[PDB]
C-alpha cells in the first residue's frame, strides 16, 4: 500500500508548508500578530494527515505486495475468506435514537433528559458491541 501512504504524505507536506508560511506571514503582517484560531487549525490539520500517513507507512513496510497492490494480479490470487461482515442489525437505529434523545435534552437544557440519553447511548452501544459475542443461554 505504498500509494495509499504517499497520498497522505503529499497532503502532509502542503499542510505543513501552509501552516508554517501563514503563521510567519501573520506574525509580521497581520494586524494583532499571529492569527491563532486560524493557525492552530492549520498546524493540527497537518497532524491529521501525519498520524494517518505515518501509520500507513509502518503498515506498508510490514506486509508484502497485496493482490490489489499488484500491477498484473489475477482474480484467483485473492481467493479465500475476506473476514466478518455483519448481515443485519437493528442496533444502529437505536444508537441514533439514543444519541438524538441526549441532543434534544442538551438543546432544551433538560438535565433529566440528558442523563437518560447518556444512559440510553451506553445501553445501545453495549448492544452493538456485544451483538456478535453473546453466548448461548445457560438456562
Amino acid at each position: 500500500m505504498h500509494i495509499e501512504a504517499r497520498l497522505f504524505e503529499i497532503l502532509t507536506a502542503f499542510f505543513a508548508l501552509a501552516a508554517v508560511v501563514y503563521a510567519v506571514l501573520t506574525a509580521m503582517f497581520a494586524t494583532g500578530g499571529v492569527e491563532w484560531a486560524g493557525t492552530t487549525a492549520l498546524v493540527l490539520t497537518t497532524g491529521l494527515t501525519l498520524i494517518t500517513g505515518t501509520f500507513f507507512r509502518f503498515v506498508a513496510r510490514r506486509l508484502d505486495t497485496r493482490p490489489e497492490d499488484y500491477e498484473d494480479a489475477e482474480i484467483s490470487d485473492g481467493a479465500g475468506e475476506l473476514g466478518f461482515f455483519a448481515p443485519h442489525s437493528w442496533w444502529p437505529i437505536l444508537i441514533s435514537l439514543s444519541f438524538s434523545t441526549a441532543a434534544v435534552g442538551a438543546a432544551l437544557w433538560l438535565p433529566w433528559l440528558i442523563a437518560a440519553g447518556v444512559a440510553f447511548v451506553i445501553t445501545s452501544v453495549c448492544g452493538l458491541v456485544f451483538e456478535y459475542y453473546w453466548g448461548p443461554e445457560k438456562h
Partner: protein, 299 residues
C-alpha cells in the same frame, strides 16, 4: 460600453470607487473572453462530434496529451497572476489611510439603526476647525475581577460619542451630511452584533464589529474625496437580526460652505431635520423612506 460591462455597478463618487470600477470592467471582460472560449468549445463538440448515423468503428481512444496538458496549465496560471497584481495594486489604494484627514465620522451601529457622529473636522485650507470629542460621556461606561481582562462584557468603552450626533429612528431615516471634495474618515463601532456599512455609490463596504480592537479588525477606512453632491442610500449588509432589512440610511453630500453652515445650526441645538432645511436641503431622506411599522398587510 462601460454602462453594460459593469453589470449594474454604480459609476462611483470617490476616486477609489472609480479605480475599483475600472478593475471590475477589465475583470469582467477577461472572464467573458474565457467563458466564450469554453462555451464555444463545448458547443463545437456538441454539434459536430455527435454520433453520425453511418460510423461503425468506435472513435480513436486517446486520453493523454502531455504537450497540451502543460500548455493549458500554465496559461490559467498566467491570467490569475496578472489579475492578482492588479488586485494587489487596487486594494492598496482603497485601504490607504491619510495620516491627516480633514473630516472624521463616528459610525455607530445597533439593533436596528445607525448613529452618526462628527469626531473631528479640520479643513485642509484652515477655513473650518472643530473638535467633536466628548470625553465626559465615553468613560461613563467603565465596569470592573472582570471576566475578560478585568472588565465585564458590558464595558462598552470601545464606543465613541460626539457632541453632534445624528440618531436614527424607526420613523426617521438617519442622514449623514458630508462635504464635497473633502477627505472623509469613517470609524465603525457596533454595539451588540455585527452590521454592515455599505454605500453602493462608494463601491466599498466594511462590516461594523463590536470591540474591533479586541478582534484585530481595522474598523477605519478613508475616501480621498467625494466628487459630486447629492443624496446616496446606504444599507446594512451583514445579517444582524429581525430588522436587518429595515435599518437603511442616507448619505447627503453638500458644498463645503453648506457643510460648514450645517454644523453651525447643529452646534446651536438644531436637530438634523431642521438643520438640513436651513441650508436649503430636504429635511428627510429622499433616496430611502422609513419602513411602515405594520408587520404586514395582514396586521
Amino acid at each position: 460600453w462601460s454602462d453594460a460591462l459593469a453589470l449594474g455597478w454604480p459609476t462611483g463618487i470617490t476616486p477609489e470607487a472609480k479605480l475599483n470600477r475600472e478593475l471590475w470592467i477589465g475583470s469582467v471582460i477577461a472572464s467573458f473572453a474565457v467563458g466564450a472560449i469554453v462555451w464555444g468549445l463545448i458547443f463545437w463538440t456538441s454539434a459536430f462530434h455527435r454520433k453520425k448515423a453511418t460510423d461503425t468503428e468506435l472513435p480513436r481512444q486517446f486520453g493523454y496529451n502531455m504537450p497540451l496538458e502543460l500548455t493549458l496549465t500554465v496559461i490559467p496560471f498566467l491570467i490569475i497572476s496578472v489579475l492578482f497584481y492588479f488586485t494587489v495594486v487596487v486594494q492598496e489604494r482603497m485601504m490607504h489611510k491619510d495620516p491627516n484627514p480633514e473630516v472624521v465620522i463616528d459610525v455607530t451601529a445597533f439593533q436596528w439603526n445607525w448613529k452618526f457622529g462628527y469626531q473631528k473636522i479640520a479643513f485642509a485650507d484652515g477655513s473650518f476647525d472643530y473638535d467633536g470629542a466628548d470625553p465626559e460621556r465615553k468613560e461613563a461606561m467603565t465596569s470592573r475581577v472582570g471576566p475578560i481582562r478585568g472588565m465585564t462584557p458590558e464595558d462598552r468603552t470601545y464606543l465613541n460619542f460626539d457632541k453632534i450626533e445624528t440618531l436614527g429612528t424607526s420613523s426617521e431615516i438617519p442622514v449623514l451630511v458630508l462635504p464635497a471634495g473633502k477627505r472623509i474618515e469613517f470609524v465603525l463601532n457596533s454595539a451588540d452584533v455585527i452590521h454592515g456599512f455599505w454605500v453602493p455609490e462608494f463601491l466599498f463596504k466594511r462590516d461594523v464589529l463590536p470591540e474591533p480592537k479586541a478582534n484585530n479588525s481595522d474598523n477605519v477606512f478613508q475616501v480621498s474625496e467625494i466628487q459630486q453632491t447629492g443624496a446616496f442610500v446606504g444599507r446594512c449588509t451583514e445579517m444582524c437580526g429581525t430588522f436587518h432589512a429595515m435599518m437603511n440610511f442616507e448619505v447627503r453630500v453638500v458644498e463645503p460652505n453648506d457643510f460648514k453652515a450645517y454644523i453651525d445650526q447643529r452646534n446651536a441645538g438644531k436637530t438634523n431635520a431642521e438643520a438640513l432645511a436651513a441650508i436649503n436641503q430636504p429635511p428627510l431622506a429622499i433616496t430611502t423612506e422609513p419602513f411602515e411599522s405594520r408587520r404586514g398587510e395582514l396586521v
